[PDB]
Swiss-Prot record, chain B:
Region (Disordered): 1-31
Protein's organism: Schizosaccharomyces pombe (strain 972 / ATCC 24843)
Keyword tags: Cytoplasm, Ribonucleoprotein, Ribosomal protein
Gene: rpl3602
Name of the protein described by the UniProt record: Large ribosomal subunit protein eL36B
Subunit-level organization: Component of the large ribosomal subunit (LSU). Mature yeast ribosomes consist of a small (40S) and a large (60S) subunit. The 40S small subunit contains 1 molecule of ribosomal RNA (18S rRNA) and at least 33 different proteins. The large 60S subunit contains 3 rRNA molecules (25S, 5.8S and 5S rRNA) and at least 46 different proteins.
Presence of keyword Ribonucleoprotein: yes
GO molecular function, one term: structural constituent of ribosome
Curated annotation (Swiss-Prot), chain D:
Taxonomy, superkingdom: Eukaryota
Family: Belongs to the eukaryotic ribosomal protein eL8 family.
GO MF entry, a single one: structural constituent of ribosome
Purpose of the protein: Component of the ribosome, a large ribonucleoprotein complex responsible for the synthesis of proteins in the cell. The small ribosomal subunit (SSU) binds messenger RNAs (mRNAs) and translates the encoded message by selecting cognate aminoacyl-transfer RNA (tRNA) molecules. The large subunit (LSU) contains the ribosomal catalytic site termed the peptidyl transferase center (PTC), which catalyzes the formation of peptide bonds, thereby polymerizing the amino acids delivered by tRNAs into a polypeptide chain.
One cellular component (GO) term of this entry: cytosolic large ribosomal subunit
Designated name of the protein: Large ribosomal subunit protein eL8
Parent-record interval covered: 69 to 236 of 259
UniProtKB/Swiss-Prot annotation, chain F:
Its biological purpose: Component of the ribosome, a large ribonucleoprotein complex responsible for the synthesis of proteins in the cell. The small ribosomal subunit (SSU) binds messenger RNAs (mRNAs) and translates the encoded message by selecting cognate aminoacyl-transfer RNA (tRNA) molecules. The large subunit (LSU) contains the ribosomal catalytic site termed the peptidyl transferase center (PTC), which catalyzes the formation of peptide bonds, thereby polymerizing the amino acids delivered by tRNAs into a polypeptide chain.
Principal cellular location given in the protein's record: cytoplasm
Molecular-function GO term, any one: structural constituent of ribosome
Keywords: Cytoplasm, Phosphoprotein, Ribonucleoprotein, Ribosomal protein
SS bond list: none
Organism: Schizosaccharomyces pombe (strain 972 / ATCC 24843)
Record protein name field: Large ribosomal subunit protein eL13
GO CC annotation: cytosol; cytosolic large ribosomal subunit; preribosome
GO biological process, one term: cytoplasmic translation
Self-association and partners: Component of the large ribosomal subunit (LSU). Mature yeast ribosomes consist of a small (40S) and a large (60S) subunit. The 40S small subunit contains 1 molecule of ribosomal RNA (18S rRNA) and at least 33 different proteins. The large 60S subunit contains 3 rRNA molecules (25S, 5.8S and 5S rRNA) and at least 46 different proteins.
Top-rank taxon: Eukaryota
Localization of this protein: Cytoplasm
UniProtKB/Swiss-Prot annotation, chain G:
Function summary: Involved in the biogenesis of the 60S ribosomal subunit.
Family, similarity comment: Belongs to the NOP16 family.
Keywords from the named record: Nucleus, Ribonucleoprotein, Ribosome biogenesis, rRNA processing
Gene: nop16
Phylogenetic classification of the source organism: Eukaryota, Fungi, Dikarya, Ascomycota, Taphrinomycotina
Main location: nucleus
A GO term from the CC aspect: nucleus
InterPro entries in the cross-refs: Ribosome_biogenesis_Nop16
UniProt keyword rRNA processing, yes or no: yes
Name of this chain's protein: Nucleolar protein 16
Disordered: region residues: 1-23
PANTHER family for the chain: HSPC111 PROTEIN-RELATED, NUCLEOLAR PROTEIN 16
Domain of life of the source: Eukaryota
Subunit structure: Component of the pre-66S ribosomal particle.
Amino acid sequence: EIDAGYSSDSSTEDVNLYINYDIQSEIPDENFDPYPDYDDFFTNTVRETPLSSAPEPKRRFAPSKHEQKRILQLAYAIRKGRILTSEQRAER
Amino acid sequence: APGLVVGLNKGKTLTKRQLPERPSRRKGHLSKRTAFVRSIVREVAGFAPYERRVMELIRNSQDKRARKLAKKRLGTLKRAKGKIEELTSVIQSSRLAH
Amino acid sequence: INNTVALENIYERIKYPDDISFVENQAVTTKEPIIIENVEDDLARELAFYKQGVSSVKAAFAKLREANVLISRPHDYFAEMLKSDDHME
Amino acid sequence: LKVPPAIAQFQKTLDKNTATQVFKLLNKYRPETAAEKKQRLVAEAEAVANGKVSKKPYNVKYGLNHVVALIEAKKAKLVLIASDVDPIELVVFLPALCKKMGVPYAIVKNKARLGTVIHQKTAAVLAVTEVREEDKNELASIVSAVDANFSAKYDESRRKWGGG
Amino acid sequence: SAGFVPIKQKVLVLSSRGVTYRQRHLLNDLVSMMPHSKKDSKLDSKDRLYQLNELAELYNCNNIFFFESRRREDLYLHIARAPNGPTVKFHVENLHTMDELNMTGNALKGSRPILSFDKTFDTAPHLKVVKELLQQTFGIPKGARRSKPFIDRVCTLTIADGKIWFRNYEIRENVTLIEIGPRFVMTIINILEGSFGGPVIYKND
Amino acid sequence: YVKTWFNQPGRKLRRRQARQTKAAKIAPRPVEAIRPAVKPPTIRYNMKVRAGRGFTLEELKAAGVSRRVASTIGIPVDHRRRNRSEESLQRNVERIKVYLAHLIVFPRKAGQPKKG
Amino acid sequence: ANPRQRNKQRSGKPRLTRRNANKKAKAKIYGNFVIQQNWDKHATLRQNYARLGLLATPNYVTGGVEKLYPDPTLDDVLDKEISIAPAKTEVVRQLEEEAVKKAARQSNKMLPLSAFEHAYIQRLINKYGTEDFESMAKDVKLNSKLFNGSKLKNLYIRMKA
Amino acid sequence: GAYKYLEELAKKKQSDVNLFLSRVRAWEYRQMNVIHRASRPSRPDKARRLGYKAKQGYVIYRIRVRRGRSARCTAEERVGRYCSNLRVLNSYWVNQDATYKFFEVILVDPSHKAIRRDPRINWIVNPVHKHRESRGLTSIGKKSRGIGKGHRFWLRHNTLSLRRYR
RNA sequence: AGAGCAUAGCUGUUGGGACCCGAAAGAUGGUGAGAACCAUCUAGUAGCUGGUUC
RNA sequence: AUUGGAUAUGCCAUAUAAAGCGCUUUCGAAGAGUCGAGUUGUUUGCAGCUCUAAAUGGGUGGUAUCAUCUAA
RNA sequence: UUGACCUCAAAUCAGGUAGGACUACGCGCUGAACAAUAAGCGCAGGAAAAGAAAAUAACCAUGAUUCCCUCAGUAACGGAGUGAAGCGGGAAAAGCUCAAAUUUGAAAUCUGGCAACAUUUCUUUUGUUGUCCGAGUUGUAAUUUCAA
């Protein structure tokens, strides 16, 4: 049950001259702390495990593949005579 | 022969089928990393002035005051109930430490 | 469906006190059956309902007078009116 | 105004001595320049063209998404954050994330020095994940110095509202 | 504390997403004639009716009014008593708000009316329940804030062909009742035993 | 404002020429794609069988056509529709299989590098 | 009537006449050569497709067709196999014969190993046997590219052919 | 990634960090011109998710519009008029105060060769995208004119269609 | 123990400028210097006036 | 004389590459002054103003729990 | 003192782009009298807009958009009047791109200058290759878009 009470803070309020029968100010609130100290409620403890459970790909244990793509492209240009070799650059 | 008979009737014999779940319906599922990121951001960023009011109300009992304030600012009661549970957990985690 | 026993228990549980004054309850249950067969006919239905309302109003006014409670609204008193004056005008 | 603790922590940076030692180890692990990478690749290209096994490269780690990923995976041993990132929100969470993962971290002065290490104009953050076996002691000494000069020091002003 | 100057009755007014011009006007008009009715925002979930009790408990209203709208055309009215209590569903038809011109009544706002109930309400136990519930809710209890001790209106509930007709009248000195303006038909749908929950105990059929 | 229909014969001819212009571009293959057979979504028409938009991914998988090659051979794909009953699955798998039985797919040239 | 159209009428300059008005004209066929050779430039596209033994639509037709002369169980659908369909006309037979003869000609789908691929797989075979590929892939020194068992199996198969 | 942190931090629109930064930056932005070029987006997560790429041909412009039509739509048209050689791509809210609402617009140069050679932004070069913000073809413009899918969102009715055989 | 549906013509009737013509509205946008003048909405109108063809 | 798409046939082809379909003792990120709530107008939409979110969440429907969809 | 970075600048520096006109048909912001109309203002193209569901439905379910027929002068609103939509039948059919997860065993990305080589509706147009500088780690490529 709720007893159909009435809180003291409801938006509705009680109370020619209206005297025939019966039944603003700048008030502050309280001394409040506007700049509370930083509260570390989550990072006060260290998470010991990595955040990601995804498996480790094999690309991180093997020689780089996009470097290999460039190497094959550079080797092709050397074969086609488009890029001067290091020896050719040195002798020139 | 290829061709559609576009008239009526194909057979009233019916048998249901079991369908899986589409990946779109998985929306709203909480990720482990996302929940971690939100907890980090919630701590790094402070609290709104209205959130500080609700937190200080919750600490000094006054649960009806906090619920009424949260509903007034957020809107619906569902949003207000979620904020109280979130801010209550923030208080308890803080009170366990400081 | 239409559980008489359940309704009777609910009525008893949420029954208002019988000793409560009619002025406090502001409810009237005068014995005047307002039966209007011509439901579509507005004039016939209104007259049947007004007859019960007139009897109920008179009984409540007499009860209010016997209860030392002001029933008639004073003309000098100026309170907010629920009815829209602009709509009537 | 009053500076929030998350932003006020960027006013206290690593001191002169420890920062100098930090960049001394970092300068041994600078990434390969665009020119140096080109020479190494054409050298392998000449070997491939004529007739034809290496080791994993060691260098500092840069890039914000990359470094934050390394911290979350606990792969980073030391994270150095630029103290003057123009939109501060890019790094305002970084000290706390480094605290959650238990990664040693420091806030070094300006981003030009960090960018110079990586041959860029600007680096908001640098991370060290792997060092050679001969640099294990040097990295361990810096981690202790960073802890003693940045973490053991302060640790109370970073919770206080600075400015005003 | 638990409650300061606790008035005997209080009414909570709500609505669902999709109310129309007439439905909104009727809700505003009903609030106007209800001095101690706490109007509230829209209810987000059109299905979760368990939240009404928590809303009533929070606002200390023992009576709940819900204006549920479906298909943007039909309007339903749910009335219940916060603590457990019977939840009775109504259908609202023949809408005539204050925007019309036929009405010519004049009743003071907050004035305590006189509730007249037809004898047909005593024919069946379910009609007895709805009459008692309407009397407890519609009737303004003494001591209510903004209420007026004077009487300038009378509410009449005429049961016609199984449907309740609500008519608000004006008392004129000489009774010569004059319609206040709220006119609609209360068509009972079903009555429950709990606050927007529990098994249904009465089906109008 | 009156909408006249004096161009009704002209539009009939213009659409016919579009069909012939399309057939000139794609000589041996049909001017329309094969549509599935579906049931209209109401109690008034659910006994009728009409043409759908495209074949569901479960229909294509059963018939042996992957969703990446289905469009290349003129089989539309409807990612939205699903088979709630085994009858719709069987009605449209057979439609695909009959379509593939009558299909001549001309080969395409492929680049084969000389080395490995 | 418009001032622009009056302007060019008053001019002594000729109009930019173009003659592109010829209806009843049907688009000529490009693309398939066999279709173009057998196409009838007068008949409609439905009449030509039917004569050539092709299907102009795999679906229903949305009107009445022309009549020129007075004519005189899921298991057994997902698992049944239909053995193609007969070629009604000669044109379809040319299309079918051309398709199979081109597919046979362009049928070399076996890739021979290159110089690097040959050496890579040879070093792995001459050390870890021939039938054990899982151990071949788990080697880190010889298998530097970290190919899995399937790729090493394919390198073996391509080496054989 | 660090954009998950920035996207989550941007939701706490008036936390201690966000309120302080919004107050500080509003003071600075009011010192500069009404429409002024931004060296880099203040919200690199939000600009990134709205199509912006940190490459040549992509331009960020900040603008303030008085509060008290849509404000975002007004920001887009004024910035698009300011640099009329560029195409307005998208826009986003960055800040607001009691007097002004601040927005940043992402503009794309349709003559730069880094834009004309990118197939992912090649579409904006076509002349049908000249002044999209003036025809309501941006995200806020589409929302402002009720363009959408569903029941939530005349000439053909006012006509009298008269067929040949009727 | 169904009598309808479609088309055409005729007649009546209701709308469209609606048999023709006859009083100034008003509004929008301009020109010239309060007032004046111009162009469109606009076939906004005459309970009536006059006329309405072998 | 210009050019379309193809066909056929040479010459090159940087394939240590890149794809579709099997399988899973491994993972699966999803758009915020936005949704929404209140109040004023225009016409449910749109906009201003005050406030301001969520993660199996959110939108929209049938229930009066289920269905459907996955916005900024 | 010098250098790196940032910021503010300047330049008859080099290379580009905007304006104005026409608007029958687009799309916007507006807006009277009597119509969401005229007029006013802004912005396009050969079409525009819309568009691959935060869509319907309650079925044996449908499946981006647009248009036509029908639904239907119906439901609904409000008696008059205003007046749709789902389904159904046709025309045409085509699907996709990102943001958000580390390439991290290698910024794999791009503009510009210069120098050659081609190429042209074209000595007028387009590129390619090489080199240097710049952009870019406050994120350019590949990969992924929930249908996964």
